[PDB]
């Protein structure tokens, strides 16, 4: 099998910058290599074939080069919508092989989250469970601490988090923290609060609500 | 321009045949290959068939596991995976190409190997510049798709990767932000589809 070792593994850079991904073949593969870009929630899309040639509709700010065992993809005016994972591909000798990939995040100014809290539906409660959701919206960077509290006692072990890939337009992230309790547990307490700590905030902001009002 | 057979939940040791067909042309008069995406996101060339010389080309790693055939008559390509194990759980794409012209991948087929049974999600309203959403809880297997107002609403929509909760059931919420003024003027319906369990539900999200 021909190995394609690609680097860097991960890279963060500002809009308008120039960066380059690289691939190392383990055997001169001529110029039989392609470059692929895969945006969040989509199949990969070929950018380049034959190391330096572009496919229609692929912006000129993409260029490929190199040969033998040394290949490079360069992006020259990094745009937000550029946020993706990039892969090189060798197709000079079967079996075709892909590089491990390069995840390109974009550096943007800090931006504080917008915090919203959601009580469980009166319809979900009926069935036995209670999920209290806390949404942190459009922030940067991706690092954020969320603390759940109920009647002012801090919680652990009954929450889960999820974060979206960087938004292609505003380069922000969004996160959700979900508190899962049993119906009984939920009706035991009154005050339900979600506290958010983020470097874009001078001091942690709290969004809470009282049960039944 | 490519369609692929729906998502799949296949019991270990059992098998699965994935289909792939084009809408306005025959994929069978172009080269066709399949690619597997697994542990996180990472690609493996399975094998391919050339339209001008009998015989599918296979990668050894999948010799014995993958069988590739076509049916030039119906313009359909097939991939048969036998003896499935949890390491066959992945997104499988069929791709088409011709010389240096195009090279286009299909949407993807999620494939989960597991003895569990399919379970559609419960969809709960996440009641309300303001945010609203839908909790899509307790479904199996992945994936599920959510959309707002039948597709009409796309700005500010944020759908979160699903989390595998301890019960072995998947869970995620979709959110959207809108103008608060709009809360007494516009109806907001989230539409959830979970192909595997033939579960399709519309949920009105309104101010509680
Ligand atoms: C698709 N590709 C590379 C490539 C991809 C898949 C195969 C392949 O699997 N061929 C089997 C015989 O038809 C061969 C080559 C074509 C040439 C440009 C770069 C992209």
Provide structural commentary.
The complex is a heterodimer of chains A (213) and B (208). In chain A, a hairpin with a 2-residue loop joins β7 (62-67) and β8. Chain A starts with a strand and ends with a strand. Chain A has helices at residues 122-125, 183-188, and strands at residues 4-7, 10-14, 19-25, 33-38, 45-49, 53-54, 62-67, 70-75, 84-90, 97-98, 102-107, 114-118, 129-139, 145-150, 153-154, 159-163, 173-182, 191-197, 205-210. Chain A is 5% helix and 51% strand. In chain A, the strands form four sheets. In chain A, strands 2, 4, 5, 6, 9, 10 and 11 form a seven-stranded mixed beta sheet that branches. Chain A is elongated. Chain A folds into two domains: 1-108, Immunoglobulin-like (Sandwich); 109-213, Immunoglobulins (Immunoglobulin-like, Sandwich). Chain A is built from two helices and 19 strands. With 213 residues, chain A is mostly beta strands. Chain B has 208 residues and is mostly beta strands. Chain B has two domains: 1-115, Sandwich (Immunoglobulin-like), CATH 2.60.40; 116-208, Immunoglobulin-like. In chain B, 0% of the residues lie in helices and 50% in strands. In chain B, strands 2, 4, 5, 6, 9, 10 and 11 form a seven-stranded mixed beta sheet that branches. In chain B, strands 12, 13, 15, 16 and 17 form a five-stranded antiparallel beta sheet that branches. In chain B, a hairpin with a 4-residue loop joins β7 (66-71) and β8 (76-81). Chain B is elongated and about 65 Å long. Classes of the chains: A mainly beta (213), B mainly beta (208). The structure holds ligand KHA. The ligand C[N+]1(Cc2ccc(C(=O)NCCO)cc2)CCCCC1 sits between chains B (31, 33, 48-50, 57, 97, 103) and A (34, 49, 91, 96).
């Amino acid at each position: 099998e021909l190995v394609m070792t690609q680097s860097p593994k991960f890279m963060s850079t500002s809009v308008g910058d120039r960066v380059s991904v690289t691939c190392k073949a383990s055997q001169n593969v001529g110029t039989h290599v392609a470059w692929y870009q895969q945006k969040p929630g989509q199949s990969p899309k070929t950018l380049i074939y034959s190391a330096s040639y572009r496919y229609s509709g692929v912006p000129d700010r993409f260029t490929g080069s190199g040969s033998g065992t040394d290949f490079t993809l360069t992006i020259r005016d990094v745009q937000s919508e550029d946020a993706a994972e990039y892969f090189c591909q060798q197709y000079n000798l079967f079996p075709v092989t892909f590089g491990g990939g390069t995840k390109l995040e974009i550096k943007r100014t800090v931006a504080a989250p917008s915090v919203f809290i959601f009580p469980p539906s009166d319809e979900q409660l009926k069935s036995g469970t209670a999920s209290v959701v806390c949404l942190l919206n459009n922030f940067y960077p991706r690092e954020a601490a969320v603390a759940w509290k109920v009647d002012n006692a801090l919680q652990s072990g009954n929450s889960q988090e999820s974060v979206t890939e960087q938004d292609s337009a505003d380069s922000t992230y969004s996160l959700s923290s979900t508190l899962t309790l049993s119906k009984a547990d939920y009706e035991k307490h009154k005050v339900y609060a979600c506290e958010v700590t983020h470097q874009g905030l001078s001091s942690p902001v709290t969004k809470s609500f009282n049960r039944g009002e | 321009q490519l369609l692929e057979s729906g998502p799949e939940l296949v019991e270990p040791g059992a098998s699965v045949k994935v289909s792939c067909k084009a809408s306005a042309y025959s994929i069978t008069d172009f080269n066709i290959y399949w690619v597997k995406q697994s542990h996180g996101k990472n690609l493996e060339w399975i094998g391919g068939i050339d339209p001008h010389n009998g015989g599918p080309v296979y990668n050894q790693k999948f010799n014995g596991k993958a069988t590739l055939t076509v049916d030039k008559s119906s313009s359909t390509a097939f991939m048969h995976l036998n003896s499935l194990t949890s390491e066959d759980s992945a997104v499988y794409y069929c791709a088409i190409f011709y010389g240096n012209f195009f090279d286009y991948w299909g949407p993807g087929t999620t494939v989960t190997v597991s003895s569990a049974s399919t379970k559609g999600p419960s969809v709960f309203p996440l009641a309300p510049t303001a945010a609203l959403g839908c909790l899509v809880k307790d479904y199996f297997p992945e994936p599920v798709t959510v959309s707002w107002n039948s597709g009409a609403l796309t700005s500010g929509v944020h759908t979160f990767p699903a989390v595998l909760q301890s019960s072995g059931l998947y869970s995620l919420s979709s959110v959207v932000t809108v103008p608060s003024s709009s809360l007494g003027t516009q109806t907001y319906i989230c539409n959830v589809n979970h192909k595997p369990s033939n579960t399709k539900v519309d949920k009105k999200v309104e101010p509680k």
